[PDB]
Amino acid sequence: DENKQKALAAALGQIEKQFGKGSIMRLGEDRSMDVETISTGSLSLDIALGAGGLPMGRIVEIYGPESSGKTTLTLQVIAAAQREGKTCAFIDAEHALDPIYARKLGVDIDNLLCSQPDTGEQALEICDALARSGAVDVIVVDSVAALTPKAEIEGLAARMMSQAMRKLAGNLKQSNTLLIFINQTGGNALKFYASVRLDIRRIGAVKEGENVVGSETRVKVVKNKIAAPFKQAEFQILYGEGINFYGELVDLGVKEKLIEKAGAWYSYKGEKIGQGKANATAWLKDNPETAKEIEKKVRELLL
Numbered sequence: 001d002e003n004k005q006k007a008l009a010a011a012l013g014q015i016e017k018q019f020g021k022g023s024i025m026r027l028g029e030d031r032s033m034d035v036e037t038i039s040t041g042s043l044s045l046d047i048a049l050g051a052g053g054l055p056m057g058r059i060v061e062i063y064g065p066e067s068s069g070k071t072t073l074t075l076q077v078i079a080a081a082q083r084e085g086k087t088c089a090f091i092d093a094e095h096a097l098d099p100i101y102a103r104k105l106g107v108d109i110d111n112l113l114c115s116q117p118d119t120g121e122q123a124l125e126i127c128d129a130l131a132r133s134g135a136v137d138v139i140v141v142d143s144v145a146a147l148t149p150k151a152e153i154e155g156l157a158a159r160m161m162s163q164a165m166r167k168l169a170g171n172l173k174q175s176n177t178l179l180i181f182i183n184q185t186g187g188n189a190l191k192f193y194a195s196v197r198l199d200i201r202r203i204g205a206v207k208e209g210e211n212v213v214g215s216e217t218r219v220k221v222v223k224n225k226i227a228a229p230f231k232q233a234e235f236q237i238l239y240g241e242g243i244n245f246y247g248e249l250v251d252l253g254v255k256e257k258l259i260e261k262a263g264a265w266y267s268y269k270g271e272k273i274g275q276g277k278a279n280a281t282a283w284l285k286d287n288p289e290t291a292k293e294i295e296k297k298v299r300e301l302l303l
Helices: 003-019 043-048 070-083 099-104 120-133 156-175 188-193 245-255 277-286 288-302
Strands: 059-063 088-092 113-115 138-142 178-183 196-208 211-224 232-238 260-262 265-268 271-275
Touching (some): 043 211, 043 232, 043 245, 043 288, 070 088, 070 099, 070 138, 070 196, 196 232, 232 245, 271 277
Parallel strands (some): 088 113, 088 138
Antiparallel strands (some): 196 211
């Protein structure tokens, strides 16, 4: 001990000096790097990420099956960035944006920049041009899978990805632009250039009676160069509503014993707020100034 711990802290300090703070970490390390972040729209994912949101200036990959919830997640970090006055761009190779649902989640469709590129290579060139401008804050590319190389339009995709990635990462870093790639693939370029990689899956259905009202969702942070990796988050995405944030606040509030639950009744500061998570959720939704207070304390405790 003692000498071995001083030797470890020195070697760890040396690796960090040479390769950066996020190059090695203890997995139960409560520290996170000072980075500017954009919320994902999910309280437990923001906590699972360690820094309270997705990092500015870095590449993020979100992958999962169709209907896993990665669409909702993507539209929610665009709504979140836009809410803070950030300029967002949407690069589309899927041709699937639902603007009605996007407006329900808070996306200002009118001011969303959008490209539906002719080839995979033109897509990456437009991404780089926006990265270099210094005037765009978050770029979402939907999806890596749909970015067909020009040659394939008239392996090839992996080379395409490798080519552009170094240049892209460099320019996003300088401009402090967040770029998110939605995936289902490229190759190793994205896997090693991404600072955060999110695995999202639908693990079940939420029902009111016997009517599937939403999806039970799980995100595992499988790579995180900003804070300790491998944490996961669970939340509901209610159809036409989006991530059920207040339900997450109920659960984390109870866990941090800011809300007390005596069997089926939940109470905050001595008074009943509701019977069952649903009524407790509704009350918080109805009492936004209290909900914000509890939210603030959860983040202070857990981040």
